[PDB]
Symmetry: D2
Subunit: 268 residues, 4 copies
């Protein structure tokens, strides 16, 4: 009955019940997946939030900048799912960029220390998670990361745009390695969604009238998308990730699927 019935899927990146990762998890459970969740830093909050999911799942700590976390991850996952069992899916839904790299802060004024942290967490970690988890993935499995189309420059997105360009390149190399395991690796380039990162990171860096410029972003996206766009609903994006986690896109890898209402296909 369910799209992901019996599949074992690790989902990273829940911070709140607005997180793209929250809705990926919710939809995957509705579709029968058995999940292992990973969280960063604010584990007490994340435990509270993940209790709003349809079903209980183990929560494991994972700071992608922490070499020890990464080194122990496959073992901790194997403890969570049981020896002899492997993952069928991995979801990377993780990003960060310091305020200097975002918004109205001048592009040239971001120190490399800041950019590097943003790139570590937002791009490099996709390789490092694939490295840790591929040895415990089943053939036919699927690794999915979250992208925002960086093909053209734009206001505010600034150095996160650079990190996503890097992520897209990483994805294609992860696909090379994953292929050896019979595993797919893809990115979902999503339209704008009202998440914590959108409000705290992107919004925080926009200065004043941020709420209006964000309302503006929604209205422009909605206009450009032939099927419209709603920033208040992550479900279409979560369903898309779930399609990639399923057996229904078996010949797609190294690739990007655009869950953006088709906005990137239209000039105006």
């Amino acid at each position: 009955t369910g799209l992901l019935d019996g599949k074992r899927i690790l989902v990273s990146g829940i911070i709140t019940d607005s997180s793209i990762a929250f809705h990926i998890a919710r939809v995957a459970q509705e579709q029968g997946a058995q999940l292992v969740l990973t969280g960063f830093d604010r584990l007490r909050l994340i435990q509270r939030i993940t209790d709003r999911l349809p079903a209980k799942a183990p929560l494991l700590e994972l700071d992608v900048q922490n070499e020890e976390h990464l080194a122990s991850l496959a073992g901790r996952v194997t403890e969570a799912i049981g020896a002899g069992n492997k993952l069928d899916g991995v979801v990377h839904s993780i990003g960060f960029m310091p305020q200097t790299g975002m918004g109205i802060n001048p592009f040239f004024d971001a120190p490399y220390a800041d950019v590097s942290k943003g790139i570590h967490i937002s791009a490099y970690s996709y390789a490092s998670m694939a490295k840790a988890l591929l040895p415990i993935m089943n053939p036919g499995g699927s690794i999915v990361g979250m992208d925002f189309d960086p093909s053209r420059a734009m206001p505010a997105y600034n150095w996160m745009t650079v990190a996503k360009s890097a992520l897209e390149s990483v994805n294609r190399f992860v696909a090379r390695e994953a292929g050896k395991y019979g595993v797919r690796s893809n990115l979902v380039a999503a339209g704008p969604i009202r998440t914590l990162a959108m409000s705290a990171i992107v919004g925080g860096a926009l200065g004043e009238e941020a709420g209006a410029q964000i309302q503006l972003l929604e209205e422009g996206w909605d206009q450009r998308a032939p099927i419209g766009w709603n920033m208040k609903d992550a479900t279409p994006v979560a369903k898309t990730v779930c399609a990639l986690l399923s057996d229904w896109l078996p010949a797609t890898t190294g690739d990007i699927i655009y869950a953006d209402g088709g906005a990137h296909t239209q000039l105006l």
Copy 2:
């Protein structure tokens, strides 16, 4: 429970049992879809062939160069599915190019009458099919066409490459129109499949070493594809089309999904 359970899907483009359309149809039926078939010219042959599908489906005649077939199509489909009922999906799996625009035959020697017929059938008709059928499609519905990545030139594909470039452009305009119906329009860019068109029609224009060149094509595509590629197997491509016809990719339109083993994402 099937991926496509309860959905009404029109599938064009069956001519042989090796046709991509034939496999899209089989998989759609295994996933619970009710089909309406359309066929060109050899309707007795198509009728016979499709008696070997999992389930019986009505078959209607459609020559996309015949403006009368196109003018009557919606009413004919309505009769086939029952008045009041609408289509949830449309599959355009239609291609033609005179052999003169293909193979070892010189690119410059294809006369425009030939090229134009190919473009008419291969690209323009995606818009005329959508024009005819959009008025009888449900919101949430899905139009899917078949592509072969024409972003780069290549031996032998010649003027068909040009027609696929046109088609990708047509798809994006179709999406604009389909969106007003709450309908999606996308293409599936498939890797090479050992269909009789590939082997016999195109392989027809390929010379005395055609068989070897086709095996060589397979070997190279399989090398390049991080997850491998089997030209003998249409199933991954048909599953990809079904994915688009399902409700699992609801924010994707005007777009292209590559079902090519990830080959296009790799240089070597």
Copy 3:
């Protein structure tokens, strides 16, 4: 001293002194090129207009839909430049689309007869001109066509967008053939310029407030371009074509150079 000193260059597509082809010619002559001009239909007007160029050049009739014109072209050119002499450059600056294929006229309502004519003239003719002229081009030579970025759908451009997508594919195949002669083939994707086609074809199809929507197009383009954009000046575009005609881009072929103020590299 001149960029194109001693080079023999055929320039097609002058209709008025606002034509992109007019400015290509003007700039090429300023840079020392010896030109052969081709014109369509309105030869008396074109003769008057081409008398405003810095220097005299032979004018030859060429309707790209006329098989006889095309068949006699190399011979007529050889008569214009002298036996034993060959062309170093060819400029395709030609396009057409009937009103049904443009503007506010519904996309689905363009008859294929119309689209086909537009595609013949705007895309297919790039191959047919290359076919006629390559046998009289010097190695090191350069064929350049004019493009408008069709990667995304947009209002008004409609079926001309499809023709340019087709042109881009043709260009990459012409590059295959041209390479055998030691000749480059490239397209210049220009920003919007106030030419006859812009006003009569694009403007004519836009209905009412066309002048304001065109003013609007300029202002949006100017905003999106990091170095700004001026629709009233074709010179930056002509200089770009001249760069391609020169010896200064010797390793570029099958390709597209964007003379659009960088607008296509910016989302907003």
Copy 4:
């Protein structure tokens, strides 16, 4: 009359006489440019090497990881060219990636400290160079960086591919900033050149069969390039950079010009 007659151009990235920068510098000088050179670490060696350029040029030290070098660069360049004078051109020909992120060394085994150093030098520093030098550039000026098409993954280029993806994104944001100065920013995507970095640094990480693999690379690139390709010859690439530094591409910014023999436009 030289292409670059009277222009003042800063050229970074000479380390050996096989350096792409070395050839850009030679060609620029043959075309009448006045150069300022910048070099990293081995300044005595660079001084010696560049004594073999057509013309003597001042050489300044620049480690792009040294924020003091970057803070003083504009003033140091001004002293070199004379106060009141400004630069017309800047060439970023700087790349680095620890061998650990290259060759037959496993993609997953490159530690982030290594990758980050590579990204810093290879991508971030394009923005910090532009930051430093924009204030002393003339309108109409041109910043040019060196790229290797990273749109697809590939053997051996590994993390450098990721850094070039980042760089292409950085280029587009640099263009936004440079436009306020009336300055252009573009990359040249070069085909493989048998520079000592290619052979010795990268070829260093390539195994016991490295030489053969490099010849194989050349043979395949030459096959794919419609106009052919010679890895032994930097001249076409240097001419391409000079083209961008000239006034002949004045509407192009935030962009990428492929000097690769047209290889990227061909599948096979």
